[PDB]
Amino acid sequence: NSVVVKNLDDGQAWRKYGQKEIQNSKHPKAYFRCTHKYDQLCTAQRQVQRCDDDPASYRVTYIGEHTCR
DNA sequence: GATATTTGACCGGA
DNA sequence: TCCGGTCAAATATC
Ligand SMILES: [Zn+2]
Question: Which N-terminal residues, if any, form the signal peptide (predicted)?
Answer without folding.
Answer: none
